[PDB]
């Protein structure tokens with residue numbers, strides 16, 4: 001780094017309910033809710049009916065205080081800067097009798113010059129958080145109408161007035177915890193001469209032969225004199241200098257703009273997950289005043305990302321081109337990982353990225369009702385090769401567009417754009433989630449006067465068609481912006497499906513069968529989804545045995561969608577026998593969500609290039625709840641996660657059966673063509689015996705980045721209705737020499753129509769520290785087996801798979817909490833067991 005010193009204001013904090021004069025220890029970064037919980041002043045907010053029991057917190061004001069020492073020597077540094085990375089939300093900040101700041105935007109980092117107010121010895125920092133509810137009640141009263149924000153779970157929809165995480169007020173998968181606090185870190189920096197307020201590595205061009213960069217620095221000089229300095233940029237890879245440039249300047253008091261070109265010959269490109277290595281250069285800029293007074297570095301990925309959104313014969317395309325190659329996007333919508341943001345640990349972020357990488361994903365949407373994520377989130381996306389689609393934090397309701405609200409939004413857009421624009425992973429900006437769809441199709445025209453509706457339509461344009469796009473054009477001029485997701489397509493209107501991106505909620509809200517995903521195709525799927533109850537160990541975190549019915553108060557409850565638990569039963573009944581026990585119903589509901597959802601994922605990939613991506617709703621959960629998530633709050637992979645992994649495999653054999661006939665497609669996202677390939681298939685009954693003979697299709701090629709049909713056959717004359725109920729299709733793809741590159745299994749009937757034999761999955765266990773190895777055997781098919789353990793967060797090599805007749809299967813379960821001796825409890829479930 002440089003000669004500055006940083007003091008972390010992360011200890012010795014206390015908090016108070018205002019007007020009580022009672023102080024208790026606090027943890028910062030943190031939240032009022034966690035501080036109370038930690039003194040047993042709230043029940044577990046996630047347990048039972050306890051949501052209503054914690055609401056009172058949002059009606060109180062909350063105070064925070066800390067003290068720190070400053071030395072005579074520190075006070076003699078040229079400048080001293082206090083930085084709040086995050087204040088939630090209406091925060092009056094006092095230091096040593098000075099009001100430093102009236103903060104009003106959760107999404108903004110505040111940098112404050114404090115030398116002239118600090119004192120040798122003890123220094124006293126106090127922060128007063130006004131209730132976001134009481135702060136905005138007068139605002140609402142003056143408004144004359146209630147914004148149609150159905151996700152804001154209160155009679156008055158105050159959320160829209162505050163630049164605060166929309167989901168904190170509730171959501172259709174979320175608990176209401178309208179929290180407050182110092183949500184990101186506080187630092188004091190003691191420094192000489194200047195600081196680097198911004199360092200932007202702007203890529204000018206990239207070819208195989210050369211990368212041209214422009215290093216753009218904003219330097220804030222704090223002393224009264226003009227100061228000769230040399231600006232230096234070092235570009236290194238893996239600890240070795242690649243290129244180095246320097247510039248003489250004389251820094252003036254105040255802001256200085258410094259621009260140094262640099263080039264990297266024969267650059268090593270950053271590639272997305274599945275296409276190579278996510279190579280990151282180290283770019284370091286230093287200010288040297290004959291000592292390095294200031295330094296700032298960024299990890300930089302050298303790549304092009306173009307979003308192609310052009311009129312074509314099919315409507316309007318919507319796809320991503322990476323390093324000149326169209327890349328079919330495979331991923332999911334990401335939501336905040338906790339009701340209480342500072343509770344989400346480094347480990348939890350690293351684990352989530354591991355989950356995305358291991359599921360073969362190359363894209364995550366940071367959906368617009370959460371937060372602009374922390375720097376760590378983006379750093380991990382950079383180093384895992386995952387593209388980031390970044391919504392601005394507007395979701396599902398129109399918002400105000402008065403001048404002072406828009407000045408607030410402008411502050412947050414400039415802050416986060418400059419914060420995020422150096423990440424290799426950042427791929428596009430999206431003005432909002434679902435707001436134009438909402439304005440057009442959600443029945444507002446009957447909920448408000450014409451003049452108010454006109455006001456809302458004009459407000460939409462001010463923010464999402466003017467302010468936000470101009471801010472991106474200014475500060476991130478080479479990145480794509482689109483005003484809303486979905487921008488035109490609506491799920492109820494087939495005429496619009498060829499136009500940009502879709503949120504197909506035909507499945508779920510429109511009750512369409514999963515098979516509808518085969519015919520109802522988008523140019524890009526930015527949302528589609530299906531709910532499930534999480535597994536029992538998670539339920540046991542939030543419900544009691546008495547509450548084990550699909551619509552008791554508690555489940556209902558932990559159901560926040562406008563049609564809920566009943567829909568899960570409705571869909572289940574189409575394809576499965578509904579089990580009589582709750583635990584069995586939970587198991588099949590996981591299998592259900594997995595099988596139906598992967599059917600869509602497959603349909604989207606199969607239909608490339610018409611469709612160029614699929615991002616399911618949703619990756620993750622913020623609390624224990626029944627949701628569209630593929631990984632529950634405790635990090636347990638649902639069926640859907642293993643199925644998404646399978647559906648996103650770089651090479652996939654996709655058998656698709658419709659109108660009593662089978663097609664097999666070979667789908668590849670590899671960058672190289674596969675030549676001289678052999679598809680081989682056979683029908684095997686549930687006892688292990690082959691029906692007929694092996695079918696072989698030789699001489700197959702799988703070109704890079706294509707989906708292609710290689711086999712078709714009518715069922716009639718091949719299999720009888722009886723066989724379709726009592727066998728499966730095994731499929732394998734192999735190269736010239738017989739090496740297997742891909743396999744699949746196909747069933748010819750719905751699971752409820754299968755004549756599944758009673759059967760026992762036996763296993764042998766070899767348990768050590770951290771590790772559990774199981775070998776599973778069944779003489780007969782066991783359908784969609786779930787290997788269930790009580791260890792929260794335990795990870796599995798595979799799970800939610802069919803255990804084929806006779807064919808042994810190795811599964812490894814890992815967890816730091818696995819001890820040698822202490823045999824891991826294991827419960828193996830499968831479909832036939834769920835009914836008599």
Ligand SMILES: OC[C@H]1CN[C@H](O)[C@@H](O)[C@@H]1O
Nearest residue numbers: 172173433434527561617
């Ligand atoms: O109700 C399910 C989803 C519909 N689309 C929204 O963007 C998302 O936040 C919702 O959870």
Ligand SMILES: [Br-]
Nearest residue numbers: 079080113115
């Ligand atoms: Br200062």
Ligand SMILES: [Br-]
Nearest residue numbers: 081111112113
């Ligand atoms: Br400053």
Ligand SMILES: [Br-]
Nearest residue numbers: 255256257258
């Ligand atoms: Br200047």
Ligand SMILES: [Br-]
Nearest residue numbers: 273274275362
């Ligand atoms: Br990829």
Ligand SMILES: [Br-]
Nearest residue numbers: 184185374375
């Ligand atoms: Br952070």
Ligand SMILES: [Br-]
Nearest residue numbers: 464465469483
């Ligand atoms: Br626009």
Ligand SMILES: [Br-]
Nearest residue numbers: 657658659660
């Ligand atoms: Br069929």
Ligand SMILES: [Cl-]
Nearest residue numbers: 298299422423
């Ligand atoms: Cl960065």
Ligand SMILES: [Cl-]
Nearest residue numbers: 145448449452
């Ligand atoms: Cl009105």
Ligand SMILES: [Cl-]
Nearest residue numbers: 655656657658
């Ligand atoms: Cl099928």
